[PDB]
Amino acid sequence: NAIVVDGTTFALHGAGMSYVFHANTTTGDLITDHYGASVSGALPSPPEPVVNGWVGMIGRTRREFPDQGRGDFRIPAVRIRQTAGYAVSDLRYQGHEVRDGKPGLPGLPATFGEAGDVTTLVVHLYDNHSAVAADLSYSVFPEFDAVVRSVNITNKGNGNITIEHLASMSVDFPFEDLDLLGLRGDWAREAHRMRRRVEYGVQGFGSSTGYSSHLHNPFFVLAHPSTTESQGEAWGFNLTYTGSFSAQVEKGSQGLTRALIGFNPDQLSWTLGPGETLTSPECVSVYSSDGIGGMSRKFHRLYRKHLIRSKYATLDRPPLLNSWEGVYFDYNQTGIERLARQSAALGIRLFVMDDGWFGNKYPRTSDKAGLGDWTPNPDRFPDGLEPVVERITNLPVNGTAGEKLRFGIWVEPEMVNPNSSLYREHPDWVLHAGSYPRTERRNQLVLNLALPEVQDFIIDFMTN
Amino acid sequence: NAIVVDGTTFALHGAGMSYVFHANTTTGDLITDHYGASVSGALPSPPEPVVNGWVGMIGRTRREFPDQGRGDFRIPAVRIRQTAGYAVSDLRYQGHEVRDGKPGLPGLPATFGEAGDVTTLVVHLYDNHSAVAADLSYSVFPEFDAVVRSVNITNKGNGNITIEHLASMSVDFPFEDLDLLGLRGDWAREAHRMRRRVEYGVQGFGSSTGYSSHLHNPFFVLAHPSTTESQGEAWGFNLTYTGSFSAQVEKGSQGLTRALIGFNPDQLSWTLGPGETLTSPECVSVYSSDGIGGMSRKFHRLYRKHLIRSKYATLDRPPLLNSWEGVYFDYNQTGIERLARQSAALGIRLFVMDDGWFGNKYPRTSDKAGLGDWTPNPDRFPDGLEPVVERITNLPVNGTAGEKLRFGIWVEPEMVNPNSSLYREHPDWVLHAGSYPRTERRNQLVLNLALPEVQDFIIDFMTNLLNSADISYVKWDNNRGMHEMPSTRTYHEYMLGLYRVLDTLSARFPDVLWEGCASGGGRFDAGILHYFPQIWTSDNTDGVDRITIQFGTSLAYPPSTMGAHLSAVPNHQTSRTVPLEFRAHVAMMGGSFGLELDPATLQDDPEVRRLIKLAEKVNPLVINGDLYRLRLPEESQWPAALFVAEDGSQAVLFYFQVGPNVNHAAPWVRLQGLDPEARYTVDGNATYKGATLMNLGLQFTFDSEYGSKVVFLEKQ
Amino acid sequence: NAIVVDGTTFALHGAGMSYVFHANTTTGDLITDHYGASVSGALPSPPEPVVNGWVGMIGRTRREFPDQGRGDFRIPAVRIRQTAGYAVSDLRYQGHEVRDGKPGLPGLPATFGEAGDVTTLVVHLYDNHSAVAADLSYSVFPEFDAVVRSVNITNKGNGNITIEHLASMSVDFPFEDLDLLGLRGDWAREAHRMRRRVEYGVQGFGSSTGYSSHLHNPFFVLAHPSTTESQGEAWGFNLTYTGSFSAQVEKGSQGLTRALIGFNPDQLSWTLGPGETLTSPECVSVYSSDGIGGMSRKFHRLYRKHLIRSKYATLDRPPLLNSWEGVYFDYNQTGIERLARQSAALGIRLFVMDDGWFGNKYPRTSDKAGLGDWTPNPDRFPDGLEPVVERITNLPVNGTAGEKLRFGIWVEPEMVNPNSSLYREHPDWVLHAGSYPRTERRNQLVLNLALPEVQDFIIDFMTNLLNSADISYVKWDNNRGMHEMPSTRTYHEYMLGLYRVLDTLSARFPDVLWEGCASGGGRFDAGILHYFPQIWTSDNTDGVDRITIQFGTSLAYPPSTMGAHLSAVPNHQTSRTVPLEFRAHVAMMGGSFGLELDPATLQDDPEVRRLIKLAEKVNPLVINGDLYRLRLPEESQWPAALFVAEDGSQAVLFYFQVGPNVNHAAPWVRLQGLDPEARYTVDGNATYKGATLMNLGLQFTFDSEYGSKVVFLEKQ
């Protein structure tokens, strides 16, 4: 009974959390009632607002999947360019289904769990004027007060449509005072905490780097100004995605706050042909009445049991020695085993050989060549890699009675130096735009993992 | 020597401002060196920054026209989807031209000036790989420390391109703590000052109504945290545009701050065919070292001298009576004449007949019909409008000897009710997207001013209206936003159409006083001030709230621009009751003072006639003076403002007490902008030296819930 | 004409300051009209307040010398228990005298000047019912916008009166937002800047130690919330006293703010028999409209010209080597000359022998014995102290060609070890309360300076010591506070005693360079500075913590007044390691630069010889220059100070980076105090206009954990 449907009302209940919305049977829109501590039974309904000026009733209600261009001037969760050129969208509730468990997300990483741990509600919207569908997914992990949201867009028409913006999650908050928290930084100073009051207008952060990046993390918290690590209410939002992203919080003119996280709309022009679907990454979201740290502890438990799928999620990690900062590029077979012996002598159980072991015709003796040529450097490893790894994995570890050293290695599979064999063979494998200069960073270009040729190259040399 | 070019270094020099950038002849990019107080001679160049991680050298420099997709991860000023489908851009410096004066802007309002007042630099950029050119315009009005910028994207290729984003202005600030001021509100509470600290990431605001809107004004100030109304450094930015807009301040990872204003990207997908050009609206930028108020005063003088082109920019506005809150929709000929007679007996020099006069088959007797049919309603005006305007304009004005009453009229041309004749004939004239429901707000739809047909419909019925009777005033209203649109292109084509209309009609009738309006200040922007010398500030006519609204609006726009009416109590929007003199003193800070009530409801005629003469006495100083916001309503319950003649001969002080002040000391209000060593006679009595009035001040006490004083200063 | 009298109105005018008050002809009380920027001519009079509740008129007025017990519930400036048992006081205005120049202060240090620089106004009050006279002095130094106040209470009646509280200065401020600033700390962390909003109620600080102390300095600034180092208005108050003090700022119920400083009332129960007088220490006040920095600069010049009376006030201080941190107690004759030889060979001009040279039967070989037996230890100096000092003052100084070393001694005359000859003979000489345990701190007791036997003992051992050898520098230390006192009167009597000793000794030896010390900045007040030109700023000699310590101290006292020594690393108080050039640069912002470390432990003899030369180059600008704190160490990790020569012709910029700044932009440091239209050469290379250096500034990057730069500017 983690999800309760009553007519057009939908309630997601957790141990200490409730998420309640409903379908407006006149307009068809999804309206949010409550997202916060547990409620149950009848809910007080908000007295209807008095409308004056330009902001009509759609601009005064809390909306689950808001569009722009029909009266709402607040930042939208979806923008769609219709085949006929309009950037209008009238998505109306059609029906829903609740299922125990949680289905997979096509091509994307996502939380998972069995019927006892998570329940899922899928809500279907349809725009009859343009033949576009949406599917909004809601998953409760009741033990962790987590709601996981994602949305599908389907083109059901005969022409192309373009998704110009699509948030994974869009919550509208009531008129309250809110603080916004996030992580900001750059190389060598990631994830510095930041905390600002939410103001009228837009505030947020995102990444344009193609990756979630050093600059802002795809994560933010809204909380009351008096919320600390152990007291007060907090709402966390996490996007399960490694690409670019946008996170926007906006206090509208009427005082309701909209929070939305997902794709970066500036790096999302997703043409959908007839029948095609675009799936958004999921956004995990957590409520806590026990401080910001209460919310963190819920994320940590959820991720370790329902996101991190490796068998090492709950296992002890072996103390390792990485050779990067101790030796940098300057080594060969001889130094790598000096390092490995001295590691085993100290009780270290895993030895990692970092950058600088690979390349042949253009060897990795610096920042400047070799990425792409993933065989050992013969100048540095005369008899290859495996004689060395076998000596290395035969060292006994000090103070262990039994155990042998384990061996690890460093790769950068998505990159390539212009100064490499790979780039000379396959210069069209790299990200580039026509004849625009192929700008470098640390003397490297990025491989195009949208190309199936590049993905199989990566899968094969890693497997080999 | 206001613009100075050495090598690739361009310097724009105002009186107490300087703007310096240069082209990097290795990358082709334009790099900002300085925007602030005056520099001259050689400038220190920054030591080269060490590069580590993903942020390359392009992410560490101050740029003037930054693109994204070649290494800079910060917000861009421009985004172009090229014909082949990339969103890459590499606009490299090509050359430049300096000329004295300022070219016009095609199809848009812009500041204007002559060779002495303004000098202009155009910088040419070109993208070799995609065949796209960008031309960046910089104009200096050195007297006002103002820098006016605008940009052109011309497609020189052979396929189409799409401008997905184009900022009018784009400045990169060095690493320093900054504060962002904006004006936010909604209907009946526009232009509320907000001040927040600039944080790593993005903050800003914009508009998606299709107009500049009540929600955010297209205006913002960057200031040091310590900057006040009279101390420290402020940088202002104002977009000269009545459409949607986007304003963004981003403190990037490296600590430099990017500020940019222009089109709302989300309502800008502008296809450029081979040989087509997109022209951004101008953004006006002001620097001050004398606080936020110094910044405002330069804006005010600039707009009054180089933007408001109407002959009324410096002329005084007649005290008027608007009929809306006194009578609403329930009237006919009989009542309008009643309001006009009582108007002239009180000394009012202009009578405005608001909503409710038009429509025939579908009369404008309510919110629900007649918008579109712009002929007088025969039920209410049986012999037409011209004989009533005739009898109204023969009424003599009390206490005047000679002058007769003038007549003005309300219109809302861009709108139509479905229950009207125009809509029944031309239902395709409205904004709409295919078969989607045509959503109403206050029962009306918006006409598509991108269609030349709709433009000429408006131009023609207004030309015919203004020639059909003795009309010397038009209030041009606009009571909703755009919802569904036939294409993203229509957002900005509507505005190009509206500007053709406003340009024709205001040039054609230069002797009409035109007042803009949009449920109040829903279109309160420099774009409308170019054609209209004044704008209805807000539908909130409550004395207490008009102090916050008028103070906030004056952050960007001159008090000469602000319409303000003494209204009836209890107030129809707040239900608050404020004494009559308080209410009047607040309205006298607007450039156009007036009454908006039934004069039958006011019973002290000598007091009202006494307040109207006071309004006429202070109106010249409000129109032509410099404003000093001595005390802000945000900071205290004793707001005060000072209007100083441009030449220092005279001043008027408005001083209010909002809350009651029970059993407590009153503050001292200290003036500014006077001559320290001059003598000033305060209200015909005592005589104080400027330094005394500025360093000690005056103290006022009240024993009332609301109090107010208008005090005059004459130099000697 | 700094002082103008018109009736019962008294105006003190400075360059940009005015202080105005009047005697009320009805109540006899002195009412404050204005303290701030210049006023002249007629002043506005505040409208009379409406009185309801318990606070009558006397509670709504700005009072110059307020009493409690007749209707004013705000904190009083004076409390007198009268002979008959009342604590009532009705001191009314009787008359006044104006006098050019400034009269001395009996037994207390005070600012000085002659008739051209300073004028004094004395206002005589009298209580008829109890026969008590009060005499309020006001002195203007017009060039420095400085008002100096003090008060005298004289008993004219037949019985005793007891003064229970007596402020040197009491000002009532009008209703307005105020911030309070002061310096708070402890041993090894003196003079940390704190800033707090003034609330309703009392806030302040003081000292209970019997000395002004490390915990709070007898100094505070009232400023507007928006006031910074370079903009806005600030009022400064500095008590010229080395004993205990109390500073209280009270925002009263009605909104007016009372600031007052003076004696600590809990250590002031001063019985006055018939005819006797109690004089308060002077309080210096400075108004500035150019920010808090502008106030400091006026304090610095005022104290350099009109308070520091030693001939070294504007002389340059010889680089010195102090033996303390290098050797502590473990040394004798041979170590002292190995130290002096090695010192001379580095270019050092003065060698100071610190703690550990004295005592005979109980020698000073540690913390635990000998203070009081002020003859050289014969174990350590077997031939006497004069053969050692003669050999030392013939060592020639490296890189000087000519000059011979100077020699200086450490003393701590107010203290005695129980383990000493002195205490065994005269145990009645220390401060104690009957049989109460005589608590030690650092194993010493405090000699009672209120005894004339004690004062003469000190005058004597010091006179005999300074006449035995060629000693031209004395460090006068004091390493604990007061605990048990024989009576409350003894706190103030002690200081009158200490001041007799400092006046006598400093006048008997005007060629000695005297340095105050008290475990560092434990007595860093204008009282000491009158007699000693410099003071040991802090025992914390770590480069990072000293940046904060020196920027805080400079808030009130000139940099020429601060001693700062380059110390060894790891630091003995913080365990921090910081680079040598960074330590040396922090120490050059002090007036008396030196080294406190074993000259062998330093490896780079050229680097420290280069640094000493740099120190002697910057010293004239630190001694005579004007301090501009450009960026505070409390605001960011890039603090920076600029020293501009009196005449504007040279300057030196100290710039620091405290943390590491990894992968981030660096700020720009903008200068101030320059001529905008002049050209300045920076470090002998690039030449810039003043406007550029002030409006755009310079930017430095570093790739270390700590960075520093010392940059010279020459006009033209």
Side-chain angles (χ1 to χ4, degrees), chain C residues 406-555:
Chain C
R406 294 164 63 170
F407 183 80
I409 194 97
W410 180 99
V411 290
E412 183 177 359
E414 302 149 54
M415 305 287 177
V416 64
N417 284 121
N419 200 353
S420 74
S421 293
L422 180 64
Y423 189 78
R424 281 178 184 91
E425 175 171 310
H426 301 300
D428 322 89
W429 282 10
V430 309
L431 294 166
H432 66 283
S435 68
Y436 282 104
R438 287 167 191 208
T439 52
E440 290 154 56
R441 171 85 292 275
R442 207 188 189 209
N443 327 108
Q444 39 191 90
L445 300 171
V446 185
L447 285 191
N448 180 3
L449 269 81
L451 303 184
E453 308 114 275
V454 167
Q455 305 155 28
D456 287 318
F457 169 72
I458 297 175
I459 291 167
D460 227 272
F461 89 72
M462 289 300 297
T463 292
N464 279 0
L465 172 82
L466 286 176
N467 280 334
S468 68
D470 189 15
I471 295 148
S472 70
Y473 170 100
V474 172
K475 183 149 118 85
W476 181 302
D477 204 350
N478 188 293
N479 282 297
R480 60 160 288 185
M482 300 184 198
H483 300 182
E484 306 81 9
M485 303 291 287
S487 83
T488 281
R489 199 182 175 97
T490 313
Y491 288 101
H492 188 50
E493 271 174 352
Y494 180 114
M495 290 303 315
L496 297 166
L498 176 54
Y499 287 142
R500 172 167 109 82
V501 162
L502 301 170
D503 208 2
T504 292
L505 283 157
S506 71
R508 180 168 304 178
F509 302 95
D511 300 322
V512 171
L513 173 47
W514 295 85
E515 185 174 288
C517 178
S519 314
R523 299 195 297 208
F524 207 129
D525 52 74
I528 280 301
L529 281 182
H530 189 58
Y531 307 105
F532 298 166
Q534 58 184 54
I535 293 182
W536 188 226
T537 320
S538 174
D539 279 349
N540 197 338
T541 62
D542 165 75
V544 176
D545 284 354
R546 275 294 198 120
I547 291 174
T548 304
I549 291 165
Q550 289 163 213
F551 268 67
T553 300
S554 85
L555 182 56

Side-chain angles (χ1 to χ4, degrees), chain B residues 33-34 36-53 55 60 62 174-177 200 224 226-228 231-233 235 252-256 287 635 638 663-668 670 677 687-689 691-693 695-701 703, chain C residues 33-34 36-53 55 60 62 174-177 200 224 226-228 231-233 235 251-256 287 635 638 663-668 670 687-689 691-693 695-701 703:
Chain B
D33 302 329
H34 178 69
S38 282
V39 297
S40 91
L43 318 180
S45 58
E48 194 211 327
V50 158
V51 161
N52 277 287
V55 183
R60 290 150 202 281
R62 301 164 70 178
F175 167 52
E176 43 174 8
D177 304 345
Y200 288 96
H224 292 328
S226 46
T227 293
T228 60
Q231 286 136 53
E233 294 192 282
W235 294 264
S253 77
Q254 286 302 319
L256 319 166
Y287 168 81
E635 312 168 329
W638 305 275
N663 177 36
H664 198 276
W668 286 75
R670 301 165 50 176
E677 263 303 274
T687 303
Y688 305 109
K689 298 72 206 165
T692 308
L693 289 156
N695 308 327
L696 212 172
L698 305 167
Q699 172 173 68
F700 302 112
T701 55
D703 200 27
Chain C
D33 294 312
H34 175 76
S38 298
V39 301
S40 96
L43 305 195
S45 65
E48 167 214 353
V50 60
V51 170
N52 292 291
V55 180
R60 315 176 183 252
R62 298 171 65 188
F175 175 47
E176 56 184 351
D177 284 351
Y200 286 102
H224 287 132
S226 48
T227 296
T228 81
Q231 46 151 278
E233 323 182 18
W235 296 255
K251 211 204 207 201
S253 93
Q254 289 302 303
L256 313 179
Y287 170 84
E635 295 296 332
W638 303 271
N663 189 28
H664 195 274
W668 291 73
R670 286 171 57 182
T687 286
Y688 302 113
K689 299 230 67 160
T692 314
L693 285 173
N695 292 328
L696 160 57
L698 303 175
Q699 172 187 83
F700 311 91
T701 63
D703 198 29

Side-chain angles (χ1 to χ4, degrees), chain A residues 153-166:
Chain A
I153 297 291
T154 305
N155 185 355
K156 296 254 147 203
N158 302 128
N160 294 324
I161 70 180
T162 296
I163 309 305
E164 272 291 350
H165 171 68
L166 179 68

Side-chain angles (χ1 to χ4, degrees), chain C residues 201-360:
Chain C
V202 287
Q203 53 263 290
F205 44 81
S207 165
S208 266
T209 72
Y211 310 102
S212 70
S213 97
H214 314 92
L215 323 179
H216 299 269
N217 200 276
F219 169 84
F220 71 88
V221 178
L222 294 175
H224 287 132
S226 48
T227 296
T228 81
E229 287 285 312
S230 38
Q231 46 151 278
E233 323 182 18
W235 296 255
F237 305 85
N238 194 27
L239 185 69
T240 303
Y241 194 61
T242 323
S244 304
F245 71 99
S246 193
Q248 314 181 44
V249 179
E250 197 215 49
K251 211 204 207 201
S253 93
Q254 289 302 303
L256 313 179
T257 296
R258 188 168 284 190
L260 52 92
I261 191 174
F263 291 118
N264 174 3
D266 315 348
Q267 310 185 326
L268 173 74
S269 265
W270 196 272
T271 295
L272 287 184
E276 308 203 349
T277 296
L278 175 62
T279 309
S280 82
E282 60 148 38
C283 173
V284 189
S285 200
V286 174
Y287 170 84
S288 177
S289 96
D290 305 329
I292 279 150
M295 167 216 81
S296 304
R297 277 188 301 275
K298 295 203 262 260
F299 268 127
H300 297 176
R301 201 52 77 183
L302 177 74
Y303 284 172
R304 274 182 294 200
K305 269 148 99 124
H306 302 280
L307 167 91
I308 300 167
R309 78 191 197 162
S310 147
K311 80 170 164 77
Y312 282 92
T314 73
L315 287 189
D316 297 54
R317 315 300 158 78
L320 65 81
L321 182 122
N322 186 288
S323 66
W324 170 246
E325 258 189 49
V327 153
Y328 284 107
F329 293 95
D330 317 341
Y331 71 84
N332 86 320
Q333 269 205 23
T334 280
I336 281 303
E337 302 168 8
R338 163 179 49 80
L339 279 205
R341 274 187 321 272
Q342 275 143 23
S343 271
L346 293 172
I348 291 146
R349 307 233 206 208
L350 161 68
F351 171 72
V352 183
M353 163 165 76
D354 208 279
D355 204 334
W357 56 272
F358 52 91
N360 179 11

Side-chain angles (χ1 to χ4, degrees), chain B residues 519-551:
Chain B
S519 315
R523 302 206 284 203
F524 205 130
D525 48 74
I528 288 277
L529 292 165
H530 192 245
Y531 312 101
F532 294 175
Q534 72 183 49
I535 293 178
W536 182 231
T537 310
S538 167
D539 278 331
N540 198 325
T541 52
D542 184 59
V544 165
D545 287 341
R546 267 308 188 112
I547 311 181
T548 287
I549 292 165
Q550 289 168 207
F551 269 63

